[PDB]
Design a protein around this ligand. Structure first.
Ligand SMILES: Nc1nccc(-c2c(-c3ccc(F)cc3)ncn2C2CCNCC2)n1
Ligand SMILES: CCNC(=N)NC[C@H]1[C@@H]2C[C@H]3C[C@@H](C2)C[C@@H]1C3
Ligand SMILES: [Ca+2]
Ligand SMILES: [Ca+2]
Ligand SMILES: [Ca+2]
Ligand SMILES: [Ca+2]
Ligand SMILES: [Cl-]
Length: 347
């Protein structure tokens, strides 16, 4: 059995195996807070997330199970996955704390673009990696729904991983959210995340936020100025009569030619943005299709753009008692198998 030690971090006690040393806070994550650490077993740097009150309510308990199940399933170089999961509890009866461990990523995407005019080749690499991660999660019927620069972890070499996907069943930015999500439209698909990629890519190319709306109405008006007024077919998706009447009442605006908006950008980048930033979600390019776009020609490699194993989400439709979610979560902690340190081979 491993020996644990206690340390106060972010004003609360963390209890971790002695394997993990030099814990230092690196910010909050979804439903928890994160510390960087040194893994003395492998000499690797890791990030340890302590979930906040994982079993306080049925909402917390199911979200704890959801996150652990998802992260145990994700095995892709552009998606956050698990090196370890632990609890100081010796039994289910004692079980009240869950810690998740992944490879340390020092920054988020806001740290990459803030003080650096990115080259086009570098933007290609960043967006390529997002799309590769999205192809993988979407292939398991998992959608992010709130993709944004602060949900993209990046290391010192610009390697990127998607995180905080598949969650949520504090005031957040809405500047990157798909219109169908921001406005609660009745049905949507995986391409909500592609809208977000378009917003991110636009900002990496120009250094400016594409749609910096002050509220949901101002954000919609900014979007429509770029993409033009939608047809009546799009109203089909909106439940609220007041919202439909409002949108319908707006003066007709033509779509802008993106070449006149992103002056000086690679024409292939402009073409890709035109395919991502479409209001018709059935018309939006998918992640897999975007990976084949000529903008990524120097990075694209079909042998290294894998899909996910099938993911059983049947638990999502079930209402269970708190102790049932807790026991299921405990089972998943105990059954976790750490991956090999080296899981890759030369092409
Ligand atoms: N520094 C770093 N490195 C990797 C991941 C994270 C991380 C996690 C997280 C998720 C699962 C897990 F098992 C361990 C940690 N959740 C939020 N963050 C963020 C902390 C600050 N914003 C950027 C990443 N932070
Ligand atoms: C922070 C800087 N970003 C912006 N001012 N974005 C809004 C503009 C862009 C999106 C719509 C079409 C064009 C291009 C004109 C506006 C509205
Ligand atoms: Ca390759
Ligand atoms: Ca490597
Ligand atoms: Ca290897
Ligand atoms: Ca090959
Ligand atoms: Cl599974």
């Amino acid at each position: 059995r491993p020996t644990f030690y206690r340390q106060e971090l972010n004003k609360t006690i963390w209890e971790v195996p002695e394997r993990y040393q030099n814990l230092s806070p690196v910010g909050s994550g979804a439903y928890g807070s994160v510390c960087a650490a040194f893994d003395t077993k492998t000499g690797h740097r890791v990030a340890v997330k302590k979930l906040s009150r994982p079993f306080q309510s049925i909402i917390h308990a199911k979200r704890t199970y959801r996150e652990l199940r998802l992260l145990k399933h994700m095995k892709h170089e552009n998606v956050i996955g698990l090196l370890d999961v632990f609890t100081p509890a010796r039994s289910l009866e004692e079980f009240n704390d869950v810690y998740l461990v992944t490879h340390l990523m020092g920054a988020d995407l806001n740290n990459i673009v803030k003080c650096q005019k990115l080259t086009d080749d570098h933007v290609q690499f960043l967006i390529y990696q997002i799309l590769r991660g999205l192809k993988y999660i979407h292939s398991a019927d998992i959608i992010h729904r709130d993709l944004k620069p602060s949900n993209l972890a990046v290391n010192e070499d610009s390697e990127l991983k998607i995180l905080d996907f598949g969650l949520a069943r504090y005031v957040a930015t809405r500047w990157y959210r798909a219109p169908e999500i921001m406005l609660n439209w009745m049905h949507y698909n995986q391409t909500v995340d592609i809208w977000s990629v378009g917003c991110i890519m636009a900002e990496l190319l120009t250094g400016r936020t594409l749609f910096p709306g002050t509220d949901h109405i101002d954000q919609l008006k900014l979007i429509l100025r770029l993409v033009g007024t939608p047809g009546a077919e799009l109203l089909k998706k909106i439940s609220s009569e007041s919202a439909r009447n409002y949108i319908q009442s707006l003066a007709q605006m033509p779509k802008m030619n993106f070449a006149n908006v992103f002056i000086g950008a690679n024409p292939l980048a402009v073409d890709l943005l035109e395919k991502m930033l479409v209001l018709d979600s059935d018309k939006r390019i998918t992640a897999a299709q975007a990976l084949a776009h000529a903008y990524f020609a120097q990075y694209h490699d079909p042998d290294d753009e894998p899909v996910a194993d099938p993911y059983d989400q049947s638990f999502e439709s079930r209402d269970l008692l708190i102790d049932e979610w807790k026991s299921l979560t405990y089972d998943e902690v105990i059954s976790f198998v750490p991956p090999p340190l080296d899981q890759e081979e030369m092409e």
